[PDB]
């Protein structure tokens, strides 16, 4: 009747959702394990995982302090008066602020477990030396010194996903997304490599708060920035992340990364330019954290890219050991994570096998301005169904024409299988867009028709009355082909 | 074979909606009728109606404008330093750009005519002669210049509501939102007399805008500002008002109105009390604007209140003639005229029987902070349902513990029927909740349970998220009975 019943490792958005629910909801003994207990250096993610720590929560403040610098530009259209030489921003009064508010909700995590029978925290690196054995060394070298011998029942592998670097010489004059969020200064010059969402908000970011004459550059390797969303977006986006002075370089990819004397970085581009910048940030994609665990030694399966194999239910190749959120490389956000948590514990304790819909997730790219897509893009559809229509609006708030910012358009596009009306996706870019989206998304739940939205009556004046009033397909795809 | 298919007598919201259908959609000889094309006195509504000339869209500019006071505030916990002593709103400025804007929109209007065979607009009072027969008069006067004479098919009336006033002494002295429009310089002193959204949306606008040592005060009859709608959410919205500044004058009435030498005007409240402001805005009310049709001579039905009494077609008594908007006074709303507008169409046009839904109407406040509302308030739900079920939710968001802004809880209420678990109600107070709210009606209208809501999968970090977090009811109603538990 080993000494626990539930040994999580990774105390992360899915990891501790699934340690607290066994533990408060069904009388286990849980030993939780992760790497520290405060955000930041070393370690960077901490208890409660990336999204506390090094993700969605300081992402996000971060993500809102850099609005002001249009909002208290666009102000100006609607007669605020004020002394706009004087704007300066303030790196240092930002960062302490997110640090103040990260560090409250690690303090919150700490009580959290003075307060759950059978929860325990246990500190250091987890690894496996059989099914039942999880030890927990003071390092992640596989020789290194053992803290701990955990014997346990079953065994949840919820160890997130990492900073990915390219291999190129420089890429240690680079930081990732982690160190990124200590900045001492924010950069005059940045450059933001990779095309994802993570890139794309750090630009807005660092592109806020910059020097006055300063410049943000996002190089990315392909043709066009963030792949998986919606293509006609994706060019929208493009255009607005230009208009607001940054510069998208497609085709893009350091070469040779280089320090110069004064600190800065010289980079050299595959295509032959070069350019120097005070920061220069690689947020090429994230790889499931898996390596140091030794899987080997418990039988369990990974892909070629290090991610651990699960079925439906999470569960590996070997019946009591399980792995959620990024790790398994299904749908990396926190959400996903969070339920593929909540979901094991039904399975496995509650005996009401449950597993995750990773169909119709709803995300945002608080981009700015952002995005909220939900579902399919017509590609997916197009391939899966007889045929797809795609609706399409979009069009230039009255306060934009107003404030300024004329460039920002606001757009929904919606994708349906043509056959019998269903939504399969909607995408928005636009302001409000994550929060709009998010009501979207049951409405898929409870799969909604395109006759749906359009019956119910608009609440005006919103962005978000605009799904209601699509009632004729911009296009189709009939049998995998554009038709009309 | 007859002069026209359909006279339309108010340009407005639903009036414009069946007008263009009717005629873009069905070729019917369609002509319509407003008092003016240009936004503005003498007459405020106009082409396009009272949304657009004097309503929503003024009215969002000019609140949009406003949030930049709070905004340019609180970028001071995100690290922005700027001249804050400097910081100075100019009215002028906002009702300029305003303007501009509505303008735009009613120039649009007459283009909207030019090319589109059928549709004609025609400038003046309509009035009825008889149930075929639409009297374009010179003005409200029935002794006016009839100004033409439009033989007519079917007729509908379409002329929305206007402002309703007190009958105190310095009524006169007041104005009104087709007033406050504009406005020469934003009052610094300002009393808003109404427990309305019109009325709590120009506090915000004022408050914001008003010079220094300025001080906006919100009077109200009830006990309670908006009536109607959930009572946390008006409560905690008192809340936020007051945080802010504005002055909430519960169970005040303004007895007389003076004016004072300096042009401002002193008001004496019920209770005795006094004050003097330089503008006093009437909100109290809005009434269906049908009086000087003369619905009299073609036998038209007309409730006490001025309301064109309609079945759910919209079709009055007199089988020819329907009504609809602010008018027939079912849900005074522009999609709700629009909807109604395109129904009729249909029914007439297209013998396509629709009848709009006055029902699971989705709609906002746009004060500061907004609310974003559809559904049954418990109370309503109460009488209703032997069991009903109310989940609620409310926190501080986090950028607000960093902005200053502490006192803004976003405020998430749902109310279901026990029974089956039917979402009913879900009512929301907070920022963006305008937006979040009206995929929730696409929701309710499908009828959603509220395992259906979370079992959604969350979008973090946003303040929506929170209705897919809401599985555990907070208290009940059993049998009209509020009970902490069913037994
Ligand atoms: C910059 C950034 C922004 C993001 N923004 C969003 C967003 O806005 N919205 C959103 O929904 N998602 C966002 N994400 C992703 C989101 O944070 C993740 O999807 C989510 O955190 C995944 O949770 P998880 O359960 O996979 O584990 P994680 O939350 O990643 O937690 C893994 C934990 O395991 C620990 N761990 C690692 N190795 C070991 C070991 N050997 N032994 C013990 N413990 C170990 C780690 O230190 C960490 O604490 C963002 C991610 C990043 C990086
Ligand atoms: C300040 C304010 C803010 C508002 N904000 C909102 C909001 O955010 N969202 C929302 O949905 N609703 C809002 N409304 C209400 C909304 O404007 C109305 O519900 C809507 O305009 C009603 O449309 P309608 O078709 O009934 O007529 P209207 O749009 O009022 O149009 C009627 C037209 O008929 C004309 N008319 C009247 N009498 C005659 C006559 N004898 N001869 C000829 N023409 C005539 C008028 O000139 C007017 O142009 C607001 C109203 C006000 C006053």
Request: glycine share 10%.
């Amino acid at each position: 009747s080993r000494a626990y019943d539930l040994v999580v490792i990774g105390a992360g958005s899915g990891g501790l959702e699934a340690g607290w629910n066994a533990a408060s909801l069904h009388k286990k003994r849980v030993a939780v394990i992760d790497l520290q207990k405060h955000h930041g250096p070393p370690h960077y993610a901490a208890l409660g995982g990336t999204c506390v720590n090094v993700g969605c929560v300081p992402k996000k403040l971060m993500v809102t302090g850099a609005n002001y610098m249009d909002t208290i530009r666009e102000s100006a259209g609607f007669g605020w008066e004020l002394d706009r030489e004087s704007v300066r921003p303030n790196w240092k009064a930002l960062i302490a602020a997110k640090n103040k508010a990260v560090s409250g909700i690690n303090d919150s995590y700490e009580g959290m477990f003075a307060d759950t029978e059978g929860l325990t925290f246990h500190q250091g690196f987890g690894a496996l030396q059989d099914n039942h054995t999880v030890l927990v060394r003071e390092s992640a070298d596989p020789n290194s010194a053992v803290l701990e011998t955990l014997d346990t029942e079953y065994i949840l592998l919820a160890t997130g996903s990492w900073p990915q670097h390219l291999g190129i010489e420089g890429d240690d004059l680079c930081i990732t997304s982690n160190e990124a969020f200590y900045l001492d200064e924010a950069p005059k010059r940045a450059l933001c490599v990779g095309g994802g969402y993570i890139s794309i908000e750090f630009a807005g970011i660092f592109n806020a708060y910059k020097a006055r004459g300063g410049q943000v550059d996002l190089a990315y390797r392909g043709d066009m920035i963030l792949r998986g969303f919606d293509s006609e977006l994706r060019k929208q986006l493009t255009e607005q992340l230009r208009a607001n002075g940054i510069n998208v370089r497609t085709h893009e990819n350091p070469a040779k990364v280089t320090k110069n004397a004064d600190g800065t970085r010289h980079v050299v581009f595959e295509s032959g330019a070069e350019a120097d910048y005070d920061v220069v940030m690689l947020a090429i994609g994230r790889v499931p954290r898996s390596q140091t665990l030794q899987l080997e030694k418990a039988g369990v399966e990974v892909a070629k890219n290090g991610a651990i194999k699960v079925d439906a239910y999470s569960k590996t190749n070997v019946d009591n050991i399980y792995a959620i959120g990024d790790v398994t490389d299904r749908v990396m956000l926190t959400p996903v994570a969070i339920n593929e948590g909540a979901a094991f514990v039904d399975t496995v304790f509650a005996n009401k096998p449950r597993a995750t819909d990773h169909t119709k997730v709803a995300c945002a790219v608080f981009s700015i301005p952002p995005m909220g897509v939900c579902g399919y893009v017509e590609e997916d559809a197009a391939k899966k169904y007889d045929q797809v229509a795609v609706y399409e609006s979009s069009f230039t708030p009255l306060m934009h024409n107003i404030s300024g910012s004329t460039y920002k358009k606001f757009m929904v596009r919606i994708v349906t299988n043509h056959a019998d009306g269903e939504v399969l996706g909607v995408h928005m870019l636009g302001d409000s867009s994550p929060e709009i989206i998010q009501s979207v998304a049951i409405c898929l739940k409870m799969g909604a028709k395109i006759s749906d939205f359009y019956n119910t009556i608009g609440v005006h004046p919103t962005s978000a009355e605009e799904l209601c009033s699509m009632r004729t397909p911009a296009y189709f795809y009939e049998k995998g082909k554009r038709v009309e």
